[PDB]
């Protein structure tokens, strides 16, 4: 079902996961669930224009978790 998430679904997920400031970057880059499942580490860390601290946790604890589950 993550593969079916809209951009707004992705924004809502990261808002509810505790990254409401960084969630808007997924809207800015038009990242839906299908694109989310295609992202690699450098895409999150350097491609979203977000601070490195949250970016590291967004990838390792959510994007990577989503791609593996």
């Amino acid at each position: 079902s993550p593969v079916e998430w809209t951009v707004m679904d992705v924004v809502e997920y990261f808002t509810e996961a505790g990254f409401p400031e960084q969630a808007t970057a997924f809207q800015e880059q038009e990242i839906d669930g299908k694109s989310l499942l295609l992202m690699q580490r450098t895409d999150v860390l350097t491609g979203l224009s977000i601070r490195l601290g949250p970016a590291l946790k967004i990838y390792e604890h959510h994007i990577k978790v989503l791609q593996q589950g």
Copy 2:
């Protein structure tokens, strides 16, 4: 055949494929079919100045598909 595509052909491909806003980047970077078949992942995600969501699908389901065909 992609290898013979002009820059106009590459722009038309991504427009017809549903990326009309991103197709502009292929004109800006003067990417013909021969250059298209040389592109790697980071060239699409960071070399076109396009949004990451569309860039991820452009590489995975189009540039990669054309190169493997």
Copy 3:
């Protein structure tokens, strides 16, 4: 343990370590101890906007050491 360090704990650590000018970058990027243990080499050298000389020592003699201890 480092995994529980706050952002201000991280800034304090690098201040005591002799990088007080670079310590502000960890505050800027909101890097706590959990984020610190997720960092890779390029994150320190290109993601903190600090000088390269201090960045190389910060990674080799502190971040690496903390991740390996």
Copy 4:
């Protein structure tokens, strides 16, 4: 042999090779024949500030060919 080419020699080569617009970037970056033989793929695609399309051909059909000869 290319290893002896001056910066101007490199500029004239790419001018004669059909990349006159991109040839000035080798003057800007002060790339002589010895530097040319040290370049890797990302150096051409991101280090010359040239368009991606021409840069891909410049690496694949010229710089790589000179390094492998």
Copy 5:
């Protein structure tokens, strides 16, 4: 002994090696001998804000040589 070099020692080295314009970047990035021995290729090519041609020689013929000697 290279590991004991100060920042200006490094600046002096690259000036005498024939890179006086690029030697200033080692002062700007506060790179002493200890930091010089930690540098990798991409640090020289993208982290010093120097022209690519000289940067390629600086890494291959000097920084790599010092690290291996």
